[PDB]
Amino acid sequence: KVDEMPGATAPLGKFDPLNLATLGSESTLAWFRAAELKHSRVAMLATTGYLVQAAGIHFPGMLSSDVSFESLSAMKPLDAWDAVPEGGKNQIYFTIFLAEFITECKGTHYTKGGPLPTIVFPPIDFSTVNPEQLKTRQNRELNNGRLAMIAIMSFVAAANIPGSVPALAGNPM
Amino acid sequence: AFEDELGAQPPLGFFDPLGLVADGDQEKFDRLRYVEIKHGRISMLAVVGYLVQEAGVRLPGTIDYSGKTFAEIPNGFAAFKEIPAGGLVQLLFFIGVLESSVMRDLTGEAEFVGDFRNGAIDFGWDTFDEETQFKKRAIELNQGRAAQMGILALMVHEQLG
Amino acid sequence: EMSKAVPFVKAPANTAGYVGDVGFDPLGFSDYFDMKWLRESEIKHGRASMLACLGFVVQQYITIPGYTHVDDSNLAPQAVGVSAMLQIVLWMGVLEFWTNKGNVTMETMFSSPDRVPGNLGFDPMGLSVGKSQAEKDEMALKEIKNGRLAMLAIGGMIHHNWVTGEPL
Amino acid sequence: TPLGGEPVFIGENYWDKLTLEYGSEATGTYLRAAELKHGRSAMLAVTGFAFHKLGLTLNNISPHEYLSIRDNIKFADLAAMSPIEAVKHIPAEGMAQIFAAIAAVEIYELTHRNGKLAYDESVAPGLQPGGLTGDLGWNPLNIKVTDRRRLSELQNGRAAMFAISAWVAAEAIPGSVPI
Ligand code: CLA
Ligand code: CLA
Ligand SMILES: CCCCCCCCCCCCCCCC(=O)OC[C@H](COP(=O)(O)OC[C@@H](O)CO)OC(=O)CCCCCCCCCCCCCCC
Ligand SMILES: CCCCCCCCCCCCCCCC(=O)OC[C@H](COP(=O)(O)OC[C@@H](O)CO)OC(=O)CCCCCCCCCCCCCCC
Ligand SMILES: CC(=O)O[C@H]1CC(C)(C)C(=C=C/C(C)=C/C=C/C(C)=C/C=C/C=C(C)/C=C/C=C(\C)C(=O)C[C@@]23O[C@]2(C)C[C@@H](O)CC3(C)C)[C@](C)(O)C1
Ligand SMILES: CC(=O)O[C@H]1CC(C)(C)C(=C=C/C(C)=C/C=C/C(C)=C/C=C/C=C(C)/C=C/C=C(\C)C(=O)C[C@@]23O[C@]2(C)C[C@@H](O)CC3(C)C)[C@](C)(O)C1
Ligand SMILES: CC1=C(C#C/C(C)=C/C=C/C(C)=C/C=C/C=C(C)/C=C/C=C(C)/C=C/[C@@]23O[C@]2(C)C[C@@H](O)CC3(C)C)C(C)(C)C[C@H](O)C1
């Protein structure tokens, strides 16, 4: 049921014109739920990770042995991805590769009604937090991700097609 | 006898100038439909062949491995002069296998003669009334009648020039 | 009392309920050996022959890419080597152990009351499933006869080339 | 007694000649299975061809365009030599890999009957009468399995088949209709 779900706010309510929540079973909807939950958290970190990396925040010192943080007083934030060395790019994926495991190896997987993906390290005891005010936050968490999923696509389209975005094309990136 | 059957149609109708079904001298009530349909089916693929096989649309590549292309092969009885004689047998043979193995009543559920498949010229056809059968089985039969006079022309006019 | 096939020697016993039965056993092998093993042999010799009769003819004209066209089928192993040949026969083995649930000798085969000769369980398309007995007997007479023709065939195809030195 | 045919019009024809006189009900299943396999294959092929023609390849859509990684096989060069003359430029290693996945899938469709592989059998589960129904059971996040879905899938299959056949023909030689 789309009623009783965080993510249904005031200006639209149940937003499903093409009826995709009905398209599978209840296990199907739980997969799309934590997809959008995960699509949000990647896009929120990438949108915010685009705005800085563009104003010059600049970690002091050396990233690696000879490829130190000149990647910011230089090439666009969409770049500095091949400038990061391979052993540096490798440990990023593998910390993620580890983090995708505890996410999957809980006692009850979430499409069987289990909990949503939680923090891998330092997991405070969690949302023992007043479930009325818990529902307001999961609306806040998803809506900021909804806005960030659009925004990171704006940032790619501006870096590929100049003039594809009006009040944003006059920005050095 | 067979004045109300398939093929009798205006302006002529039943028109037997030889007295062919006028008796059963060699059981003319059957097989003469089958002998009339069978020649025409050859002729309809022949004339829709031969006119398209005059217009100049060819298969790509070569007829064999030795480089003889299809575009070098002209139309007519001259096309058999540029078929090597090993091809002339196999062109007959697996067609001759069809005469003994698909060109006969195989399953025994034939409503008619030329009735072999039952389901694949069913071209949205099941909806149409039994009368539509008699129409497009006259239209089968009379295309085949008129394509022989097409192909007997287009074989004799080549030799006449 | 007398044989149907050759009517001047006595009729062979213990060949009655079999498909191509015309009483042809003048040397009396069915008197001495188990009849289920002999039938299973004759079907298998026939099926390998029928595949080899297609093979011997189609190999001259079709060749799969990567190999070398050989004019005579008989010279093909030399043109394929030994490694490729051993792979064929060792996998034939693995296909034969799974075939009869591990009962591969003349003492272990036909030790179950099931397991009739030639019934592999092989029928992916559904040919002869749910039909009557006379039709089943008729189609089994065709597999034997075509297999017997192919055994004496695959001799001639192979033998013709032995003398001569050119394809079929 | 088969599944739904043409929606606008229907016609079974060549079906009772093999599922009654020549074969039986077991042949019916097999035929349907084969049809579904072909349909799916055609669909994928169609999509691939479409993508290739359009231009959305690795160079256009991602940061990596070097497929060979030793044989100097970039995506740009393979996207500039059409679709039919590109499959022949694929490195043997890659070909081997692809054949592997397909082989595995086919074997599964052959051994693993229902939930798990069958250890003892005269022949493979799918090599028996009605060995392969058509459905492999692969239904990740399965939305629905109704009587409409199946029909739709089938229709998309035949259509895809025809489409790709036509496409291939046209790349090779004068077809008939436009593209
Ligand atoms: C290629 C794909 C593939 C798949 C998906 C599987 C999957 C499986 N194998 Mg097989 N296997 C494979 C290839 C595959 N195998 C190959 C190439 C070999 C070597 C030749 C084996 C050798 C083998 C052995 C020896 C054994 C298995 C076992 C199993 C099953 C685990 C045992 C069990 O109790 O689960 C049962 C599953 C369920 C109860 C859930 C059923 C739900 C269905 C839908 C299955 C899940 C979907 C399906 C697997 C996905 C395939 C679709 C594909 C497009 C990805 C599991 C279903 C074990 C087994 O099944 O027997 C005890 C086992 O002993 N496998
Ligand atoms: C290899 C793919 C394949 C297979 C196995 C089948 C199999 C089947 N189809 Mg089918 N179909 C296909 C492709 C395929 N089709 C394509 C591309 C289309 C779109 C034109 C259709 C459209 C279609 C309709 C509209 C219907 C079926 C139906 C059926 C079923 C009954 C008909 C029958 O007995 O077989 C058909 C005959 C064969 C499979 C024989 C094989 C063909 C020979 C060997 C070679 C033909 C080559 C040919 C020249 C290729 C060019 C295309 C052609 C149009 C000229 C049967 C399971 C019917 C059904 O579900 O039951 C009522 C049905 O309603 N099909
Ligand atoms: C809690 C359990 C911990 C599990 C460990 C795994 C995650 C560890 C992350 C950090 C590694 C830190 C070790 C420090 C080591 C250190 O920092 O060395 C730095 C080293 C840099 O090497 P370079 O070749 O760049 O250096 C050459 C120059 O340094 C010489 O001039 O980077 C690494 O080797 C990357 C390690 C990635 C390893 C991937 C791990 C395994 C996952 C594989 C799964 C993927 C394939 C399967 C997919 C299905
Ligand atoms: C690369 C190929 C290797 C893949 C192995 C394929 C496994 C075959 C399938 C097993 C049957 C399973 C069916 C039911 C399972 C079953 O119960 O049957 C097991 C089967 C015998 O089964 P039974 O006991 O029912 O047979 C009757 C016995 O009771 C005897 O009276 O023995 C084997 O599995 C042999 C497997 C081949 C072993 C290959 C090893 C090679 C050794 C050869 C040494 C060479 C010496 C050279 C000279 C010096
Ligand atoms: C076209 C043109 O020219 O104009 C431009 C205009 C403009 C405005 C530039 C454009 C834009 C898009 C915008 C403005 C996009 C913004 C997107 C947005 C809103 C991105 C938020 C990310 C949230 C983060 C990072 C939060 C992490 C929060 C983290 C990591 C937490 O710790 C969670 C937290 O809860 C805990 C667990 C503990 C709590 O105690 C509280 C905190 C927070 C600590 C366009 C569309 O591109 C076009
Ligand atoms: C009355 C009448 O008319 O007939 C009746 C009787 C009759 C005819 C028997 C009937 C039937 C059955 C029919 C018509 C069956 C036909 C089935 C048909 C026509 C099946 C095609 C499959 C195509 C495939 C699998 C292609 C895969 C393509 C693949 C796998 C690709 O790789 C594509 C590829 O491009 C990529 C993506 C990338 C490239 O780098 C490489 C290539 C180029 C290879 C009917 C329906 O009952 C009608
Ligand atoms: C809701 C709904 C519908 C819908 C929908 C919609 C709108 C779906 C939209 C989905 C959308 C819009 C999903 C975005 C993903 C973007 C991601 C994951 C960003 C990755 C960013 C990554 C991985 C990081 C990139 C960087 O590392 C790089 C490369 C450089 C570094 O310096 C750092 C940064 C971060 C810059 C329908 C279709 C209308 C039907 C019905 O209504 C149901």
PDB file of N, CA and C in Angstrom, chain C residues 42-94:
ATOM      1  N   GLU C  42      22.306 -54.195 -30.616  1.00  0.00           N
ATOM      2  CA  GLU C  42      21.913 -54.002 -32.011  1.00  0.00           C
ATOM      3  C   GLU C  42      21.339 -52.613 -32.257  1.00  0.00           C
ATOM      4  N   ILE C  43      20.591 -52.083 -31.290  1.00  0.00           N
ATOM      5  CA  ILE C  43      20.094 -50.719 -31.398  1.00  0.00           C
ATOM      6  C   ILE C  43      21.246 -49.723 -31.350  1.00  0.00           C
ATOM      7  N   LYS C  44      22.223 -49.955 -30.474  1.00  0.00           N
ATOM      8  CA  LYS C  44      23.296 -48.984 -30.293  1.00  0.00           C
ATOM      9  C   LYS C  44      24.266 -48.978 -31.467  1.00  0.00           C
ATOM     10  N   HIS C  45      24.463 -50.148 -32.065  1.00  0.00           N
ATOM     11  CA  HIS C  45      25.312 -50.296 -33.234  1.00  0.00           C
ATOM     12  C   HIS C  45      24.630 -49.608 -34.406  1.00  0.00           C
ATOM     13  N   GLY C  46      23.300 -49.646 -34.408  1.00  0.00           N
ATOM     14  CA  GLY C  46      22.517 -49.045 -35.467  1.00  0.00           C
ATOM     15  C   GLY C  46      22.468 -47.539 -35.362  1.00  0.00           C
ATOM     16  N   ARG C  47      22.338 -47.014 -34.144  1.00  0.00           N
ATOM     17  CA  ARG C  47      22.268 -45.569 -33.962  1.00  0.00           C
ATOM     18  C   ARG C  47      23.603 -44.904 -34.236  1.00  0.00           C
ATOM     19  N   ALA C  48      24.701 -45.556 -33.865  1.00  0.00           N
ATOM     20  CA  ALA C  48      26.011 -45.027 -34.203  1.00  0.00           C
ATOM     21  C   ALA C  48      26.273 -45.112 -35.697  1.00  0.00           C
ATOM     22  N   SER C  49      25.702 -46.112 -36.366  1.00  0.00           N
ATOM     23  CA  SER C  49      25.866 -46.220 -37.808  1.00  0.00           C
ATOM     24  C   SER C  49      25.059 -45.160 -38.538  1.00  0.00           C
ATOM     25  N   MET C  50      23.826 -44.900 -38.091  1.00  0.00           N
ATOM     26  CA  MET C  50      22.984 -43.903 -38.745  1.00  0.00           C
ATOM     27  C   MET C  50      23.576 -42.508 -38.618  1.00  0.00           C
ATOM     28  N   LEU C  51      24.192 -42.204 -37.480  1.00  0.00           N
ATOM     29  CA  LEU C  51      24.884 -40.930 -37.340  1.00  0.00           C
ATOM     30  C   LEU C  51      26.145 -40.888 -38.183  1.00  0.00           C
ATOM     31  N   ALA C  52      26.791 -42.026 -38.386  1.00  0.00           N
ATOM     32  CA  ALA C  52      27.999 -42.046 -39.191  1.00  0.00           C
ATOM     33  C   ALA C  52      27.705 -42.060 -40.680  1.00  0.00           C
ATOM     34  N   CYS C  53      26.504 -42.471 -41.081  1.00  0.00           N
ATOM     35  CA  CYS C  53      26.147 -42.412 -42.493  1.00  0.00           C
ATOM     36  C   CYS C  53      25.841 -40.987 -42.928  1.00  0.00           C
ATOM     37  N   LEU C  54      25.134 -40.219 -42.091  1.00  0.00           N
ATOM     38  CA  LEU C  54      25.009 -38.784 -42.327  1.00  0.00           C
ATOM     39  C   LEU C  54      26.363 -38.115 -42.305  1.00  0.00           C
ATOM     40  N   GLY C  55      27.181 -38.457 -41.309  1.00  0.00           N
ATOM     41  CA  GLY C  55      28.458 -37.797 -41.128  1.00  0.00           C
ATOM     42  C   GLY C  55      29.367 -37.945 -42.322  1.00  0.00           C
ATOM     43  N   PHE C  56      29.598 -39.183 -42.740  1.00  0.00           N
ATOM     44  CA  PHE C  56      30.446 -39.487 -43.889  1.00  0.00           C
ATOM     45  C   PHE C  56      30.090 -38.739 -45.180  1.00  0.00           C
ATOM     46  N   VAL C  57      28.816 -38.408 -45.366  1.00  0.00           N
ATOM     47  CA  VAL C  57      28.375 -37.727 -46.575  1.00  0.00           C
ATOM     48  C   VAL C  57      28.413 -36.215 -46.408  1.00  0.00           C
ATOM     49  N   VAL C  58      27.913 -35.716 -45.276  1.00  0.00           N
ATOM     50  CA  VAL C  58      27.781 -34.279 -45.062  1.00  0.00           C
ATOM     51  C   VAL C  58      29.146 -33.626 -44.842  1.00  0.00           C
ATOM     52  N   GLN C  59      30.131 -34.379 -44.338  1.00  0.00           N
ATOM     53  CA  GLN C  59      31.470 -33.839 -44.086  1.00  0.00           C
ATOM     54  C   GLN C  59      32.206 -33.407 -45.344  1.00  0.00           C
ATOM     55  N   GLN C  60      31.788 -33.875 -46.517  1.00  0.00           N
ATOM     56  CA  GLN C  60      32.490 -33.507 -47.736  1.00  0.00           C
ATOM     57  C   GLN C  60      32.162 -32.094 -48.187  1.00  0.00           C
ATOM     58  N   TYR C  61      30.999 -31.577 -47.821  1.00  0.00           N
ATOM     59  CA  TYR C  61      30.461 -30.408 -48.488  1.00  0.00           C
ATOM     60  C   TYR C  61      30.209 -29.204 -47.586  1.00  0.00           C
ATOM     61  N   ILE C  62      30.356 -29.327 -46.266  1.00  0.00           N
ATOM     62  CA  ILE C  62      29.752 -28.373 -45.339  1.00  0.00           C
ATOM     63  C   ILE C  62      30.767 -27.648 -44.451  1.00  0.00           C
ATOM     64  N   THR C  63      32.003 -28.142 -44.325  1.00  0.00           N
ATOM     65  CA  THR C  63      32.939 -28.001 -43.199  1.00  0.00           C
ATOM     66  C   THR C  63      32.862 -26.752 -42.314  1.00  0.00           C
ATOM     67  N   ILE C  64      32.763 -26.966 -40.999  1.00  0.00           N
ATOM     68  CA  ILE C  64      32.662 -25.927 -39.962  1.00  0.00           C
ATOM     69  C   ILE C  64      33.919 -25.054 -39.989  1.00  0.00           C
ATOM     70  N   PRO C  65      33.831 -23.744 -39.717  1.00  0.00           N
ATOM     71  CA  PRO C  65      35.027 -22.895 -39.815  1.00  0.00           C
ATOM     72  C   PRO C  65      36.059 -23.203 -38.746  1.00  0.00           C
ATOM     73  N   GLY C  66      37.322 -23.178 -39.153  1.00  0.00           N
ATOM     74  CA  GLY C  66      38.439 -23.477 -38.286  1.00  0.00           C
ATOM     75  C   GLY C  66      39.138 -24.775 -38.613  1.00  0.00           C
ATOM     76  N   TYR C  67      38.460 -25.692 -39.289  1.00  0.00           N
ATOM     77  CA  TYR C  67      39.031 -26.969 -39.672  1.00  0.00           C
ATOM     78  C   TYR C  67      39.485 -26.920 -41.126  1.00  0.00           C
ATOM     79  N   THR C  68      40.037 -28.032 -41.593  1.00  0.00           N
ATOM     80  CA  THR C  68      40.518 -28.157 -42.960  1.00  0.00           C
ATOM     81  C   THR C  68      39.650 -29.154 -43.718  1.00  0.00           C
ATOM     82  N   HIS C  69      39.100 -28.711 -44.852  1.00  0.00           N
ATOM     83  CA  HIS C  69      38.294 -29.612 -45.720  1.00  0.00           C
ATOM     84  C   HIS C  69      39.206 -30.764 -46.154  1.00  0.00           C
ATOM     85  N   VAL C  70      38.748 -31.994 -45.951  1.00  0.00           N
ATOM     86  CA  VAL C  70      39.463 -33.192 -46.352  1.00  0.00           C
ATOM     87  C   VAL C  70      38.595 -33.833 -47.425  1.00  0.00           C
ATOM     88  N   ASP C  71      39.199 -34.211 -48.545  1.00  0.00           N
ATOM     89  CA  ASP C  71      38.443 -34.795 -49.646  1.00  0.00           C
ATOM     90  C   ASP C  71      37.749 -36.098 -49.260  1.00  0.00           C
ATOM     91  N   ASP C  72      38.438 -36.940 -48.499  1.00  0.00           N
ATOM     92  CA  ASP C  72      37.858 -38.207 -48.078  1.00  0.00           C
ATOM     93  C   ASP C  72      37.588 -38.203 -46.582  1.00  0.00           C
ATOM     94  N   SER C  73      36.352 -38.512 -46.208  1.00  0.00           N
ATOM     95  CA  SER C  73      35.969 -38.554 -44.771  1.00  0.00           C
ATOM     96  C   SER C  73      36.959 -39.397 -43.960  1.00  0.00           C
ATOM     97  N   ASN C  74      37.409 -40.518 -44.508  1.00  0.00           N
ATOM     98  CA  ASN C  74      38.301 -41.437 -43.798  1.00  0.00           C
ATOM     99  C   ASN C  74      39.596 -40.786 -43.310  1.00  0.00           C
ATOM    100  N   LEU C  75      40.085 -39.792 -44.040  1.00  0.00           N
ATOM    101  CA  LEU C  75      41.324 -39.097 -43.682  1.00  0.00           C
ATOM    102  C   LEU C  75      41.136 -37.946 -42.680  1.00  0.00           C
ATOM    103  N   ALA C  76      39.905 -37.747 -42.218  1.00  0.00           N
ATOM    104  CA  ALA C  76      39.563 -36.664 -41.291  1.00  0.00           C
ATOM    105  C   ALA C  76      40.259 -36.659 -39.919  1.00  0.00           C
ATOM    106  N   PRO C  77      40.450 -37.834 -39.297  1.00  0.00           N
ATOM    107  CA  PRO C  77      41.096 -37.818 -37.974  1.00  0.00           C
ATOM    108  C   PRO C  77      42.499 -37.220 -38.058  1.00  0.00           C
ATOM    109  N   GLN C  78      43.236 -37.602 -39.092  1.00  0.00           N
ATOM    110  CA  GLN C  78      44.591 -37.058 -39.384  1.00  0.00           C
ATOM    111  C   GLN C  78      44.511 -35.534 -39.545  1.00  0.00           C
ATOM    112  N   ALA C  79      43.381 -35.029 -40.049  1.00  0.00           N
ATOM    113  CA  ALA C  79      43.211 -33.580 -40.308  1.00  0.00           C
ATOM    114  C   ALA C  79      42.614 -32.893 -39.074  1.00  0.00           C
ATOM    115  N   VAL C  80      42.343 -33.663 -38.015  1.00  0.00           N
ATOM    116  CA  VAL C  80      41.762 -33.105 -36.758  1.00  0.00           C
ATOM    117  C   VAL C  80      42.730 -33.375 -35.601  1.00  0.00           C
ATOM    118  N   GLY C  81      43.630 -34.348 -35.775  1.00  0.00           N
ATOM    119  CA  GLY C  81      44.601 -34.696 -34.754  1.00  0.00           C
ATOM    120  C   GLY C  81      44.131 -35.793 -33.820  1.00  0.00           C
ATOM    121  N   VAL C  82      44.785 -35.907 -32.668  1.00  0.00           N
ATOM    122  CA  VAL C  82      44.438 -36.928 -31.687  1.00  0.00           C
ATOM    123  C   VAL C  82      43.771 -36.340 -30.450  1.00  0.00           C
ATOM    124  N   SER C  83      44.147 -35.118 -30.094  1.00  0.00           N
ATOM    125  CA  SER C  83      43.572 -34.463 -28.927  1.00  0.00           C
ATOM    126  C   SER C  83      42.071 -34.273 -29.102  1.00  0.00           C
ATOM    127  N   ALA C  84      41.666 -33.871 -30.302  1.00  0.00           N
ATOM    128  CA  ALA C  84      40.256 -33.663 -30.598  1.00  0.00           C
ATOM    129  C   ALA C  84      39.515 -34.993 -30.627  1.00  0.00           C
ATOM    130  N   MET C  85      40.196 -36.037 -31.085  1.00  0.00           N
ATOM    131  CA  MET C  85      39.592 -37.360 -31.162  1.00  0.00           C
ATOM    132  C   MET C  85      39.372 -37.959 -29.776  1.00  0.00           C
ATOM    133  N   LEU C  86      40.332 -37.767 -28.876  1.00  0.00           N
ATOM    134  CA  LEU C  86      40.203 -38.306 -27.533  1.00  0.00           C
ATOM    135  C   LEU C  86      39.141 -37.579 -26.733  1.00  0.00           C
ATOM    136  N   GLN C  87      38.977 -36.290 -26.995  1.00  0.00           N
ATOM    137  CA  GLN C  87      37.957 -35.516 -26.320  1.00  0.00           C
ATOM    138  C   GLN C  87      36.597 -36.097 -26.691  1.00  0.00           C
ATOM    139  N   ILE C  88      36.431 -36.482 -27.955  1.00  0.00           N
ATOM    140  CA  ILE C  88      35.160 -37.042 -28.387  1.00  0.00           C
ATOM    141  C   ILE C  88      34.874 -38.332 -27.640  1.00  0.00           C
ATOM    142  N   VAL C  89      35.828 -39.265 -27.634  1.00  0.00           N
ATOM    143  CA  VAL C  89      35.544 -40.587 -27.091  1.00  0.00           C
ATOM    144  C   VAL C  89      35.503 -40.589 -25.565  1.00  0.00           C
ATOM    145  N   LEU C  90      36.233 -39.696 -24.897  1.00  0.00           N
ATOM    146  CA  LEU C  90      36.155 -39.659 -23.442  1.00  0.00           C
ATOM    147  C   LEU C  90      34.862 -39.022 -22.973  1.00  0.00           C
ATOM    148  N   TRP C  91      34.319 -38.082 -23.741  1.00  0.00           N
ATOM    149  CA  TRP C  91      33.022 -37.542 -23.379  1.00  0.00           C
ATOM    150  C   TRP C  91      31.901 -38.510 -23.709  1.00  0.00           C
ATOM    151  N   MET C  92      32.133 -39.352 -24.719  1.00  0.00           N
ATOM    152  CA  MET C  92      31.155 -40.412 -25.063  1.00  0.00           C
ATOM    153  C   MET C  92      31.068 -41.318 -23.832  1.00  0.00           C
ATOM    154  N   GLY C  93      32.213 -41.578 -23.186  1.00  0.00           N
ATOM    155  CA  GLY C  93      32.211 -42.366 -21.969  1.00  0.00           C
ATOM    156  C   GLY C  93      31.344 -41.759 -20.892  1.00  0.00           C
ATOM    157  N   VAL C  94      31.554 -40.471 -20.603  1.00  0.00           N
ATOM    158  CA  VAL C  94      30.812 -39.778 -19.552  1.00  0.00           C
ATOM    159  C   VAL C  94      29.327 -39.744 -19.875  1.00  0.00           C
TER     160      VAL C  94
END
